[PDB]
């Protein structure tokens, strides 16, 4: 939610450009003006993979089509409800064959059955 | 003529006689070293009775000197073998034969 | 013509790791008798008839890699002029089934305690199956390398390794003179039984791909220290020996004080009664002569090692004296304490670095001594007999011994340094540790060629079992096995045992893997990126960087590799299933990677690079060699010079080209024994000839023109006509009376050397074969030779030539014939067995000796079992599944 904030607001950009440019913050040992350097896209580039795997694979399609909706910039309610509605778009992917391991494996995790 | 090296010893006491059928599972080879036939890759030992010449003059006299149960290696020369003609397509003119023979049951 | 197939079973060997060997004054005893009990054995499990062999073999030659070697594959004990085996109607060496007669032979059956023999003072391999000499006897073989038994098996088998004392207890009993094969085995392991250059090893989670191995030498038996005579006594060291030698031999004196006994004043030395700590003058005076040795020549031994014994600031008083202590007080024999205490200094590692190499120079000295007086090694104290448990050099003998040798020199060196002197290791150098071994020393398991992926995010694992020189990662297609990886542009991959990333060249990359660390390897063919996690963690390079290589064209394609080196194991789990796969779900799941072999149920074959040097054709673009044809005249014959483009430059490249012809000619399969051409005797004639222009400039004490029969495997660069593979399997009729000697071998050449800056001209060399009478004779620009061979019938043999150049311009087949000797096209082509007009059709090719080349490993591996049966029967080999490959005969090459 902080990154999508941050990509909404120019000024947070900007003022972000102005902090790491005049107090002469590295950016670089902050990693072992530059927006990779810059820890916002880190924090989420280093979280992607927990969040992601939070979904199943059957919903990867619902996902691009939020991001389809996202083009268009549907309210959070909207791409909500348009995912919503979708519940049987998701799903049925014993028909595509290639998200059976990747189905097998996350119900193979501490994770227990389809809670 | 034929030879008797005895690869394996047999029994000794029984011999194939005329009038008698033995069962062999012969794997056979060429004198540099190809093979041309082999019983035991088609499953099934092959049957014939010392008398009406069914084969070859040599492999006769061969499997006659043999024993029961008794492995052994012929070397039949083309004379007592196929011989000048050859087998057409097999077995190149005047070669001399090698069969490791095994003479399994004599009935 | 036609390329042949057959169906052959597998074959594979079981030693136990017994080595031994002759050499200068080397430390190993020659004769050795092991004996083989068979204990049940079907005869025909599968179509072909249950293989089983008894003999032994060398150690560098004996490569038996599982599935088609030469002839119709079976490369068991004594299909190669390496090995030397045995059947109980047959003495099979070089791939040849020369038979033998024992006393009612009959093959290898249940209850037949093959007892084998060696006897290497001449050199000479005889049995004794079940008690019944075999009357055939090997002979003149070659002694380089070492000698392990061997068993070679079919599934279906079942044998006792028979080894002498409590290992299997010699149902018969050994020639006099002869010895247990027991008390062979270093004390540094074990014994066991193991195969023999093996590249994968079944492990608990999956195969191993095990990479090279290294064995024990010839040599590393014989100990090669410095000298005592080349030094001599420096101011300071004779005025400071004295004092070290009083020190030490009363240290020594304590050392094993109220140890084995309590000191009895009946003797004062050499059993354990030596205390003599106020006088070690009046002790034997070679016995006190020879510890002002022990001083002195271990400060020799520092100076022919190199150190520069100086003083520094005096020390005069550190608070320095012999302790007294209530214990081992002993004032009978001296009751001055040996040990000044010196807890005011100490040793740095450097005199270590020294100290080790210093109980070297003096252990492996005396062993040289006693190798010289007559004693050899064994694993039983042999007293009378003249054998020991450690007449080893420093490198093999045990831990403990070494400690105990270590400890003599460290109160030697305690003594000494507090002084104040500069005692200080010159360092060592290292170089190359030999020639041959350039390409013997990794092995590249890669997949096959018809899996490149060229798109999708792709990920394996490879679990580096230990920290070695391994590196695995993607690599293109065309992979030269000859090259290591990523010094060529066809490989991107990861060592370990740095750090580094490797491409063209090495980068720093990463940190280095300790053992169990998996390397997952992605691929980002999209975005064309590399990313390696070394344990889950992506490693990062010495930079803000993520993925080890960007833009990586997509080019022909990538496929996963692993060069594995010396002693390298591993585990290369592409993942048929992905639960096995350990990391994958950590990092390259939530990324869009999927698993390399996510759908390939069944595994992924793989190819590695042999390291059986087969011949290869002439590249038509090598960088360096040239062979161009060259139609013949009305005066020269058609000819097929060699050119050495590169020479007098920048890689002007200089090594021995192994070359030789392709197709060969063929003896008759019964012997004939019981100007212009005169048409008669060229019509009727056998004998054919050839021969080889080497030029000037090429040094004729540089080429060596002959044949080679189709199993020639030796990329020697080193070469010479000593360095030829013979035998003599000698057959008696009797005790006496011996009645035929075949010598065979693996190549027939002569050496130009022989024939000839006295002189600067062209040099021609003729190789004339009679293939009737099987001889083979030599001319030399128009003489005759010494040198003639006399081959057995069938053999086959390939024109060669094995040339070091000097000069761009090396050497020249020069196919011709002669006043009434057909060229060779009469031989190697049966269309033209009547034609005397010297041809050469382009299916005659020159073709070099290429070290290495790809080849398939099986999908399925024998399986064979090993245990201790018993305290008094010995080990106990065991293969039961039956296994078939079908194979492929090239017919010229003798070749599967």
Redesign the interface.
């Known amino acids: 939610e902080i990154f999508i904030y941050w990509s909404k607001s120019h000024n947070f950009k900007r003022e972000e450009q102005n902090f790491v440019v005049q107090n002469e913050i590295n950016n670089?040992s902050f990693?072992?003006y530059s927006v990779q350097?810059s820890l916002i896209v880190a924090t989420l580039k280093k979280m992607?993979?927990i969040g992601?795997?939070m979904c199943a694979p059957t919903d990867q399609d619902l996902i691009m089509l939020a991001k389809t909706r996202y083009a268009l910039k549907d309210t959070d309610e909207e791409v909500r409800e348009f995912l919503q509605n979708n519940l049987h778009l998701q799903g049925k992917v014993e028909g595509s064959p290639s998200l059976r391991?990747?189905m097998?494996?996350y119900r193979?995790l501490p994770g227990r059955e389809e809670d | 003529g034929v030879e008797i090296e005895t690869i394996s010893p047999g029994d000794g006491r029984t011999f194939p006689k005329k009038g008698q059928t033995c069962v062999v599972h012969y794997t056979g080879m060429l004198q540099n070293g190809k093979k041309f036939d082999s019983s035991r890759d088609r499953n099934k030992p092959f049957k014939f009775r010392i008398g009406k010449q069914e084969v070859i003059k040599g492999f006769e006299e061969g499997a006659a000197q043999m024993s029961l149960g008794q492995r052994a290696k012929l070397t039949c020369t083309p004379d007592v073998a196929y011989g000048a003609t050859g087998h057409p397509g097999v077995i190149p003119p005047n070669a001399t034969l090698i069969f490791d023979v095994e003479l399994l049951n004599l009935e | 013509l036609l390329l042949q197939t057959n169906l052959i079973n597998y074959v594979t060997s079981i030693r136990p790791n017994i080595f031994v060997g002759r050499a200068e004054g080397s430390t190993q005893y020659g004769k050795w008798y092991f004996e083989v009990m068979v204990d049940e054995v079907v005869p025909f499990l599968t179509a072909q008839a249950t293989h089983l062999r008894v003999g032994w073999a060398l150690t560098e030659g004996y490569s038996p890699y599982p599935g088609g070697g030469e002839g119709w594959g079976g490369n068991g004990v004594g299909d190669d002029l390496y090995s030397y085996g045995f059947d109980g109607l047959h003495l099979w060496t070089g791939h040849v089934a020369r038979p033998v007669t024992s006393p009612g032979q009959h093959l290898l059956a249940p209850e037949d305690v093959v007892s084998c023999c060696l006897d290497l003072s001449v050199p000479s391999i005889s049995f004794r199956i079940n008690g019944c000499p075999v009357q055939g006897v090997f002979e003149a073989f070659n002694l380089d390398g070492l000698f392990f038994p061997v068993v070679s098996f079919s599934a279906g088998v079942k044998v006792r390794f028979l080894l002498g004392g409590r290992h299997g207890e010699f149902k018969f009993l050994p020639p006099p003179g002869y010895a247990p094969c027991h008390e062979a085995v270093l004390p540094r392991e074990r014994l066991r039984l193991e195969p023999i250059k093996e590249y994968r090893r079944e492990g608990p989670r999956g195969p191993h791909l095990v990479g090279p191995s290294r064995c024990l030498s010839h040599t590393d038996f014989v100990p090669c220290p410095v000298d005592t005579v080349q030094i001599v006594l420096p101011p300071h060291l004779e005025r400071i020996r004295e004092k070290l030698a009083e020190n030490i031999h009363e240290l020594w004196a304590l050392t094993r004080i109220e140890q084995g006994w309590t000191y009895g004043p009946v003797r004062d030395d050499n059993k354990r009664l030596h205390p003599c700590l106020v006088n070690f003058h009046s002790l034997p005076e070679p016995e006190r002569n020879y510890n002002l040795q022990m001083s002195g020549e271990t400060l020799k031994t520092l100076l022919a090692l190199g150190c520069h014994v100086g003083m520094a600031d005096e020390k005069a008083e550190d608070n320095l004296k012999k302790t007294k202590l209530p214990k081992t007080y002993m004032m009978s024999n001296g009751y001055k304490p040996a040990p000044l205490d010196l807890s005011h200094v100490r040793l740095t590692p450097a005199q270590t670095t020294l100290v080790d190499r210093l109980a070297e120079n003096g252990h492996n000295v005396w062993a040289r001594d006693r190798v010289a007086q007559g004693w050899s090694y064994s694993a039983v104290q042999d007293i009378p007999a003249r054998r020991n448990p450690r007449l080893v050099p420093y490198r093999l003998l045990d831990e403990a011994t070494k400690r105990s040798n270590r400890d003599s020199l460290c109160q030697a060196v305690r003594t000494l340094l507090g002084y104040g002197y500069n005692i200080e290791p010159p360092d060592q150098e290292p170089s190359q540790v030999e020639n041959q071994s350039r390409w013997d020393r990794v092995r590249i398991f890669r997949a096959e060629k018809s899996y490149t992926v060229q798109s999708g995010r792709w990920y394996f694992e490879f679990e580096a079992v230990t920290t070695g020189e391994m590196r695995v990662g993607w690599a293109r297609p065309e992979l030269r096995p000859d090259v290591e990886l990523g010094a060529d542009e066809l490989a991107y991959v990861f060592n370990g045992h740095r750090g580094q990333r490797w491409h063209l060249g090495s980068e720093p990359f990463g940190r280095p893997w300790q053992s169990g660390d998996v390397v997952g390897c992605m691929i980002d063919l999209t975005e064309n990126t590399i990313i390696f996690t070394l344990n889950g963690e992506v490693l990062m390079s010495d930079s803000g960087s993520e993925t080890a290589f960007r833009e990586i064209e997509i080019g022909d394609g990538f496929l996963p590799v692993c060069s594995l080196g010396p002693g390298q194991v591993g585990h290369l789990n592409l993942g048929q299933d992905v639960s096995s796969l350990r990391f994958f779900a950590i990092c390259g799941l939530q990324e869009g990677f999927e698993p390399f072999a996510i759908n390939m149920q069944r595994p992924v074959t793989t190819w590695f690079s042999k390291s059986l040097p087969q011949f290869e054709p002439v590249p038509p673009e090598h960088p360096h060699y040239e062979v161009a044809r060259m139609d013949g005249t009305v005066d020269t014959p058609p000819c097929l010079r060699l050119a050495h483009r590169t020479w007098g430059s920048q890689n002007s490249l200089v090594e021995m080209l192994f070359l030789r012809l392709s197709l060969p000619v063929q003896f008759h399969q019964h012997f004939r024994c019981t100007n212009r051409d005169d048409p008669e005797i060229i019509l009727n004639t056998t004998t054919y000839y050839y021969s080889v222009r080497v030029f000037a400039g090429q040094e004729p004490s540089c080429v060596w023109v002959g044949w080679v029969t189709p199993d020639y495997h030796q990329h020697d660069m080193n070469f010479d006509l000593s360095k030829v593979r013979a035998v003599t399997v000698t057959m008696g009729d009797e005790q006496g009376n011996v009645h035929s000697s075949l010598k065979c071998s693996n190549c027939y050449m002569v050496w130009g050397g022989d024939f000839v800056r006295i002189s600067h001209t062209d040099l021609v060399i003729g190789c004339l074969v009679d293939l009737a009478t099987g001889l083979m004779t030599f001319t030399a620009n128009g003489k005759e030779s010494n040198t003639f061979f006399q081959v057995e019938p069938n053999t086959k043999l390939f024109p060669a030539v094995f040339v070091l150049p000097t000069h761009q311009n090396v050497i020249q087949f020069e196919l011709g014939k002669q006043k009434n000797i057909m060229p060779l096209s009469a031989a190697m082509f049966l269309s033209e067995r009547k034609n005397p007009a010297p041809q050469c059709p382009p299916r005659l090719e020159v073709q070099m000796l290429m070290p290495v080349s790809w080849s398939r490993m099986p999908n399925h591996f024998l399986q064979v079992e090993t245990r201790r049966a018993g305290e008094r029967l010995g080990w106990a080999v065991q293969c039961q599944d039956p296994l078939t490959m079908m194979a492929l005969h090239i017919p010229e090459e003798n070749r599967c």
Request: aromatic share 8%; net charge neutral.
């Open positions: 670089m990693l072992t350097t992607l993979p992601l795997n391991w990747q097998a494996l193979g």
